[PDB]
Amino acid sequence: RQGRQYQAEDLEALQNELEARQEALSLSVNEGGERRMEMRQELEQLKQK
Amino acid sequence: RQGRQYQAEDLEALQNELEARQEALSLSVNEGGERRMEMRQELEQLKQK
Amino acid sequence: LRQRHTELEREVSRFEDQTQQQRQQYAQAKESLTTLNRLIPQVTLLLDET
Amino acid sequence: LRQRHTELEREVSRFEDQTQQQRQQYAQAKESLTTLNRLIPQVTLLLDET
Structure with a gap:
């Protein structure tokens, strides 16, 4: 389903990296969200201008 | 820890309940965090105004 | 705008x-x-309360 | 300012x-x-490839 043959012998390391990728989800979504809305507020300043 | 006995003999069904909670965790924190953040930027605007 | 700050x-x-x-109750869950x-x-099947 | 709007x-x-x-890629992850x-x-350790 994920991979074709994916280190079935010892897969805990992948669980840890996927947890790190879930931290990356939270970082990326919050950064993209705050930055896009802050630049949208810059757009509003520009619109009023 | 959660519950007092709470069907520990065969607790599989509770994991499925906790999954709905886990999904809602992400929604509830993602939206809440974004709302306060939107107002943090608005506060800075209001501050800048 | 100060009133807006307060409500904000x-x-x-x-x-x-x-x-x-x-997050506390949901993280505990x-x-x-x-x-x-x-x-x-x-793992309770390996134990089986034998 | 219209140039700024375009780039924005x-x-x-x-x-x-x-x-x-x-969000999609990490949700599938x-x-x-x-x-x-x-x-x-x-559970792979319970099995231990014995």
Whole structure:
């Protein structure tokens, strides 16, 4: 389903990296969200201008 | 820890309940965090105004 | 705009409080799921209360 | 300022594309991690390839 043959012998390391990728989800979504809305507020300043 | 006995003999069904909670965790924190953040930027605007 | 700051600070406090409580109860529930599927992911079948 | 709007619209598009792509990719990663931590959370060690 994920991979074709994916280190079935010892897969805990992948669980840890996927947890790190879930931290990356939270970082990326919050950064993209705050930055896009802050630049949208810059757009509003520009619109009023 | 959660519950007092709470069907520990065969607790599989509770994991499925906790999954709905886990999904809602992400929604509830993602939206809440974004709302306060939107107002943090608005506060800075209001501050800048 | 200072009045707006105040209501904004009230609303920020409400979201910070709500998110804090919500993340605490939901994280405790998530940690419970992890303890269940780490300590007892059908491992109770190996135990079998024999 | 209309030049700024144009470049800002390009940037809004990039943030929307990036935020979508990462949320989907990491959500499928979450779905894969949850299947692993449900079905085989160290159950492979119980098996031990014995």
